[PDB]
Design a protein around this nucleic acid. Structure first.
Lengths: 120, 114, 56, 209, 122
RNA sequence: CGAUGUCGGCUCAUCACAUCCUGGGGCUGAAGUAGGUCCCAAGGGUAUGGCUGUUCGCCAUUUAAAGUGGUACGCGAGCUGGGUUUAGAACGUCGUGAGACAGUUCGGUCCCUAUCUGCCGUGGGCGCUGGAGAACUGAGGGGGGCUGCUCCUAGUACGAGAGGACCGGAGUGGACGCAUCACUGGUGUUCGGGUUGUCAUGCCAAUGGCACUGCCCGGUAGCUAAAUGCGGAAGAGAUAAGUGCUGAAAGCAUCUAAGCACGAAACUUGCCCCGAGAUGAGUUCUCCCUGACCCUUUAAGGGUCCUGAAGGAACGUUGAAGACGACGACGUUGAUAGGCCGGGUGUGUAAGCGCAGCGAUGCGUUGAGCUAACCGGUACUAAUGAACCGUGAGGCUUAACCU
RNA sequence: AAUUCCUUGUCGGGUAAGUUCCGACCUGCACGAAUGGCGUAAUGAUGGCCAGGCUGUCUCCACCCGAGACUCAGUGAAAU
RNA sequence: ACACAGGUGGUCAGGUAGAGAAUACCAAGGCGCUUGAGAGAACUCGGGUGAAGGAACUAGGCAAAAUGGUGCCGUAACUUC
RNA sequence: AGGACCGAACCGACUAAUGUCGAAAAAUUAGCGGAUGACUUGUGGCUGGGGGUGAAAGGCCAAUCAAACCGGGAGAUAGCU
């Protein structure tokens, strides 16, 4: 009956589900802003926020866990050199989500999600 | 819940002599023999420890006349007089449930000297 | 499983009485740009809450 | 003789001196203050309308805050009534505490149960599940027959079928109090009260004896 | 939790070795029994000479269930397997002298004092 | 006969009383115990297996009892398809034969997305007549109602003795229902670890993907039962059989015709839930609106400008709430989620390095490292100023009190 | 008995209890010798029965993982 | 009848593990199957695990669970050996 | 050596569930039987309607079989609806 649970199934199985947020994390960090639907954005907060949390602690132990998720060294190199020291003061949320429109081909609620520094 | 966390620690006993799963625990129970309140002792090996505050409990097995006899014990209960650790086991697991299958020679365990 | 008498034109419309559509009720005007957008939604230009934050 | 509304915090254990592990429920009962005293000739029957809690300034409404300013009380969260039992008057503003729940043995608990959702017949009315093998096709947990035949020609009103389960005001009767900390304004009672871990429930003295 | 068709080991030395609970006694539609109540058993496997032969309907009373029973402190005492002690069909009083293994204090009330005295412990 | 699917089982029932049990009574060839028979009584309860296709029956063993019947011999647009009752085959048997046989014997497709009625749930519209927010009273309807055993009164009442109570009280179980997660366990493909084969990250190392979560071992929260609490009631009103009182008709007698009183798990309440759509739409408390103009077949009318309140809805963060709506919490004056800090809890000595060992690998740092929904805090992110809907004192008649 | 109506025949074994099953009595309604009789090792996706093992078949179901169902967007039937 | 979970003869057929063209993961090479975005109800379909009991279910152990590999040791009634 | 055993391809179709206006006018999923033979299969021939062929079921002969389909007798005949 789903009392007190967490996570969002997204009409997708578990192996597929954890392969999405792993892949979606690499897309979020690389371009600093992505366009996706609301429940995918609302759950992406539960993935990359623990990631940037471990990205402001430079150590070989933490780099291995930062690579155990997202499985990409370039995203690991994009962290710990920029996103770590750009966020080593703010002890909170590292992203904001804005409702943009509706995915035209199927009427899906889309939402812009970006990283809160955007200084370039 | 601090309202519950208050009420949890006015009943937890203070000593709780630290043991680990794999140890050989001697535990004495306040059994009531009708009129008398004699103090009998239970002996054996801890299989599991369920470490959760006031509800912290542990399971001691006992090979007795061949048949294994297990018994869980609420740590902060008044019926448990004391917990005496005889041997220090050096198992890897946290719950030793596979010991319910084995008997005798294979049920022995190494020493935790280090 | 299957019907027995043809439902009328009156019963067809009465079933579609609850099938009306609520539209737009009240839009919102952004602080800076003055462009219309949905409540808690960015403008089609790109403003949000008096701030061109997506920078298209 | 009058009920007291309080918030369920949770359930826990209490060890007695002999060793009995009495499972209790921790019901916090804050300041229950009177907001209205209804009388026979003035308002029909007689009861007291009691409230408790702390509601924010910009959430309490004008017809609500004006009702409290008449009573001279503080705006709690919601308000309930309890029937007076043959002769008792306090005031409009009597902040009743858990003090009177220290000499009454058994009490009654009325609270809302946990909503199980749209739950089936096997879950709701304990209908025995059909055979899961031996040829059975698409009818493992279906209710089966729900009426006789052409002679009654209908389904009897009150037939136990599937629907909404729980989420309803339920009352467990005659639970025993075990301890009251009037310094902390608590209520410890024997057993289990209706659910919704941090919601409210009405505690009233024994209607059964 | 001894319901029915349950292969029970024996505790005493009545000649039985392996029995089966065919009916829990006391109460209509009763599903199973605990450590304190009696059942009706048949003899599935018996000692050659013994005191009872294979295929006899007698009453037993279980002493060690694998589910275990619960003392009022929350503690449960589980066993390795199911076991019972036989007793006469009419004037109960257990048929046997020696009783193997431990028993449980939830047998102690004016009739099973004959059992718990002959038991080694508890 | 341009189709009403056949026995039995399963699931789910429901009604009748000619009553199996529990309840209250009369008679006895009723001492007691135990029974027998009969009247009133339908509130609830009313087997498990072996054999059989079987209903039934027989048997074993329980139970307070294992009731008797109606409802297409209840129930296939709910399931089963063993029987019977298609096409194959065989035995005995009747017939020259094709074949036939409640004569047996092996095998043998069971369809339907529910429009309407009914029923279990949940909303919308509008109404209730000035509008809105809460709270309720209670017409009426439903749920629930069963009971064994031990002890006590009591080895007392009765009785030569043997045996052995009624009544009332308490403890403790079975079946049933309700609530709950403290505990006992289960589960936990979102958590930690072990491990086989292979691929990949350049390689060692360390991890990841796939193989049903690959197979596994444990296991937070949430959901639950086997787990743990609780409930059936007492009392009262009106009676049924039956027992009476007083009492004439009929100077007597008499429970009945006047009048009155006891009398059951049945009837009405008492307990719990829904409940003012109860159009007979009730009551209480609180808040809100007291600007000007014309027209008119001048009527509770239409329209103009100006203001739209309390509040509601919407939108968004979301819930131990939920199919969807609804309902509950909150929206910067903020703790409603997420993230974060700390803790708890689970897994059980991470990585890297140092030393020992030919090596695998073992110790030290290290009860470490990592920790899903849980607990207590913290505005770091998202809950944006508005806008939309809702108005401008509320008809006529009569009484009643003061102008 | 693939044959036995009466019939679940009767006795013995298995089970707590066995219209089925196994071994036998002949009382063969209505077996019988190439429309073969009686046995037979092996074989059989064959018929009946029993025991161990193993388990959600069942006592009595519980939680979880996915595909529909449910909601919004597009397209859009059918029996009757 | 269709851009149809069906049918259609032959040829080539690599790496690791493996008895193997089984099977598991991959190379060359080719596809994500022409509706999807949410919710996480009853109930249906395919599966995973399960306390104690272990055929008590049922027409019937049907279905599931279970066993399962190699070498060595060991192996009955009966028999056409 | 073998109408020998275990078991893929290939051929077949015992069991169960799904499906039953299907994904399919007999299939899919999970197990199952033959798998050096009376085996299986591609291509091309020959046998035809009271006739063929039949390890024989009244089975098969173009989704049709106790007498195929097509056209013609023929608007058969219908004491029936």
């Amino acid at each position: 009956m789903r009392h007190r649970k967490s996570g969002r199934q997204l009409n997708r199985n578990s192996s597929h589900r954890q392969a999405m947020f792993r892949n979606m994390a690499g897309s979020l960090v690389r371009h600093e802003i992505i366009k996706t639907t609301l429940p995918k954005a609302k759950e992406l907060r539960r993935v990359v926020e623990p990631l940037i949390t471990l990205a402001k602690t430079d150590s070989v132990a933490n780099r291995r866990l930062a690579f155990a998720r997202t499985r990409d060294n370039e995203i690991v190199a994009k962290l710990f050199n920029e996103l770590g020291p750009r966020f080593a003061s703010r002890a909170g949320g590292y992203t904001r989500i804005l409702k943009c429109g509706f995915r035209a081909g199927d009427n899906a609620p889309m939402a812009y999600i970006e990283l809160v520094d955007r200084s370039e | 819940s601090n309202i519950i966390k208050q009420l949890e620690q006015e009943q937890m006993k203070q000593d709780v002599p630290s043991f680990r799963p794999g140890d050989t625990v001697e535990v004495k129970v306040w059994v009531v023999e009708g009129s008398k309140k004699r103090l009998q002792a239970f002996e054996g090996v801890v299989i599991a420890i369920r470490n959760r505050g006031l509800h912290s409990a542990f399971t001691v097995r006992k090979i007795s006349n061949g048949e294994g006899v297990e018994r869980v014990f609420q740590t902060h209960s008044p019926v448990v007089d004391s917990i005496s650790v005889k041997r220090r086991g050096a198992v890897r697991k946290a719950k030793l449930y596979y010991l319910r299958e084995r008997t005798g020679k294979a049920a022995r365990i190494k020493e935790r000297l280090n | 499983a299957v019907q027995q008498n043809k439902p009328t034109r009156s019963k067809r419309g009465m079933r579609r009485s609850h099938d009306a559509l609520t539209a737009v009720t009240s839009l919102s005007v952004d602080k800076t740009s003055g462009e219309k957008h949905l409540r808690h939604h960015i403008t089609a230009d790109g403003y949000y809450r008096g701030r061109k934050v997506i920078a298209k | 003789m009058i009920g007291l509304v309080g918030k369920k915090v949770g359930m826990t254990r209490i060890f007695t001196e002999d060793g009995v592990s009495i499972p209790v429920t921790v019901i916090e009962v804050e300041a229950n203050r009177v907001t209205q005293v209804k009388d026979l000739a003035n308002d029909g029957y007689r009861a007291i309308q009691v409230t408790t809690g702390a509601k924010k300034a910009n959430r309490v409404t004008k017809p609500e805050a004006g009702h409290f300013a008449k009573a001279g009380v503080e705006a709690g969260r919601g308000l309930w009534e309890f029937r007076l039992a043959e002769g008792e008057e306090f005031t409009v503003g009597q902040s009743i505490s858990v003090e009177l729940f220290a000499d009454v043995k058994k009490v009654d608990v009325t609270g809302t149960s946990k909503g199980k959702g749209f739950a089936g017949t096997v879950k709701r009315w304990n209908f025995r599940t059909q055979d899961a093998t031996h040829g059975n096709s698409l009818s493992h947990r279906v209710p089966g027959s729900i009426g006789q035949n052409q002679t009654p020609g209908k389904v009897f009103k009150g037939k136990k079928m599937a629907g909404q389960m729980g989420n309803e005001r339920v009352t467990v009767q005659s639970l025993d109090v075990v301890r009251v900390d009037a310094e902390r304004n608590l209520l410890l009672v024997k057993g289990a009260v209706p659910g919704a871990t941090g919601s409210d429930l009405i505690v009233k003295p024994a209607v059964k004896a | 939790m001894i319901q029915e068709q349950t292969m029970l080991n024996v505790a005493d030395n009545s000649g039985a070795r392996r029995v089966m609970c065919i009916k829990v006694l006391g109460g209509s539609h009763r599903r199973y029994a605990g450590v304190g109540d009696i059942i009706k058993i048949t003899i599935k496997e018996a000692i050659p000479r013994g005191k009872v032969k294979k295929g006899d309907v007698l009453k037993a009373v279980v002493v060690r269930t694998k589910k275990g029973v619960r003392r009022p402190d929350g503690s449960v005492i589980r066993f390795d397997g199911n076991a019972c002690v036989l007793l006469n069909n009419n004037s109960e009083q257990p048929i046997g002298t020696r009783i193997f293994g431990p028993v449980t204090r939830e047998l102690r009330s004016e009739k099973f004092m004959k059992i718990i005295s002959l038991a080694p412990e508890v």
